């Protein structure tokens, strides 16, 4: 078929600031069975309809996977603004694919706080659609120059999630898969 188990059932997910990008091509994909039988927390399609994705064919498909905050799943959508949309993962206003998310508090959570997932807190400007910033360096606040080390107005642009089982659904980790849309057919 098509390697969707390698995306949705991956043992580990990337952080939102360094989201993965898997190119899907030369496969037959049954979107209908995935939508109908897999119980995700969210399955929203914007430019297409989930129930009729099989009759469509695309030259290439991208699958982006990352882990974000519970109430940050709101801004994985066209036209949304916020921390994630501006600085971590911007989605085009004419996005045509689908956004899939599910709660992963049973895996990405630790009693001592899981710091393995980072998100970009500070940036000079908003992200372009489907672009990422892997390189991390000290951000200048105010007007004073920075020497390359954190200080009074010099911050590490990467802030760590601290997922714990008792944070509640607002702060619990959510694994998000974004599918972007004639070698791929249903």
């Amino acid at each position, epitope marked *: 078929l098509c390697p969707f188990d390698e995306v949705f059932n991956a043992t580990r997910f990337a952080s939102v600031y360094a989201w993965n990008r898997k190119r899907i091509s030369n496969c037959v994909a049954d979107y209908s069975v995935l939508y109908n039988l*897999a*119980p995700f927390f969210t399955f*929203k399609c914007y430019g297409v309809s*989930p129930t009729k994705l099989n009759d469509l064919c695309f030259t290439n498909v991208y699958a982006d996977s990352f882990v974000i905050r519970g109430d940050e799943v*709101r801004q994985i959508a066209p036209g949304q603004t*916020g921390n994630i949309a501006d600085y971590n993962y911007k989605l085009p206003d004419d996005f045509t694919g689908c956004v899939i998310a599910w709660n992963s508090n049973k895996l990405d959570s630790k009693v001592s706080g899981n710091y393995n997932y980072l998100y970009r807190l500070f940036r000079k400007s908003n992200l372009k659609p489907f672009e990422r910033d892997i390189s991390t360096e000290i951000y200048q606040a105010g007007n004073k120059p920075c020497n390359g080390v954190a200080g009074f107005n010099c911050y590490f642009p990467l802030r760590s999630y601290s997922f714990r089982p008792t944070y509640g659904v607002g702060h619990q980790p959510y694994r998000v898969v974004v599918l972007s849309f004639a070698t791929v057919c249903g």
Partner: antibody
Framework: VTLKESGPVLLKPTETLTLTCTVS??????????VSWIRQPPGKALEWLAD???????SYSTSLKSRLTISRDTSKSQVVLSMTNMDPVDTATYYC?????????????????????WGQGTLVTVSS | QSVLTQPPSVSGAPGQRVTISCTGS?????????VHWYQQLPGTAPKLLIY???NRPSGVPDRFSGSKSGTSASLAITGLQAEDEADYYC?????????????FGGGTKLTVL
């Protein structure tokens, strides 16, 4: 889509209530929709009580989580709500609603789901 | 008491605009969650009226509209007919708990003068 609750009942204080909601027009195994319970005291505001979804994922009111219990039976399309240690205050009209997304053509999102279909409600009286 | 708060009652003259407000906490409305509005005519079950921020189901006249701004949401009715005399309930998803919650407004009684 039609949701129907069990008939009105009368209970003594500290009794345990069991309410059954029978659904039609949709299957409880559908991933895009769930069934929830909402109660309204006479001449008061609505209050959400419990929640159940396609994969046995269940949610309850924070203040009433200890007393509430919900379950489903896909073999007969029924959802059951149980409340223990009923007080005379808990008398109200109990509604069975469907937590599904309108604009279902665009997919589903459990964060933005709404009670798009409601039952007619049943009246539960707790008194001596 | 309810997490979401609404004015106890609003009034307006026939054919005149009326607005019902709904404000939330840092969670629910303040956390970017959508707001839905329900209309409950006397002696009847609530009816979905606005299923998302400024989204409207079929069969609802275009004189009903909604909006969201920050930690607050509003429902506006352009005209005012006789049938617009019910209770209007604000609803949202509250994420300040382990399994989540769904919070209703206090209910607003609209009267047509």
């Amino acid at each position: 889509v039609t949701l129907k609750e069990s008939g009105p009942v009368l209970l003594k204080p500290t009794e345990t209530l069991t309410l059954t909601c029978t659904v039609s027009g949709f299957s409880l195994s559908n991933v895009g929709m769930g069934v929830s319970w909402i109660r309204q005291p006479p001449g008061k505001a609505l209050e959400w009580l419990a929640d159940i979804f396609s994969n046995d994922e269940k949610s309850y009111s924070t203040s009433l989580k200890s007393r509430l219990t919900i379950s489903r039976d896909t073999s007969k399309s029924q959802v059951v709500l149980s409340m223990t240690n009923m007080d005379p205050v808990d008398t109200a009209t109990y509604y069975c609603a469907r937590l599904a997304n309108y604009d279902f053509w665009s997919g589903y999102s459990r964060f933005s789901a709404q009670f798009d279909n409601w039952g007619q409600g049943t009246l539960v009286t707790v008194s001596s | 008491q309810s997490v979401l708060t609404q004015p106890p009652s609003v009034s307006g003259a026939p054919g005149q605009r009326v607005t019902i407000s709904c404000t939330g906490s840092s969670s629910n409305i303040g956390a970017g969650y959508d707001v839905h509005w329900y209309q409950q005519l006397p002696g009847t079950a609530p009816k979905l009226l606005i299923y998302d921020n400024n989204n409207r189901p079929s069969g609802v006249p275009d004189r009903f509209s909604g909006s969201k701004s920050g930690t607050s949401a509003s429902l506006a009715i352009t005209g005012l007919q006789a049938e617009d005399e019910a209770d209007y309930y604000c609803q949202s998803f509250d994420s300040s708990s382990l399994t989540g919650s769904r919070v209703f407004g206090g209910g607003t009684k609209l009267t047509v003068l």
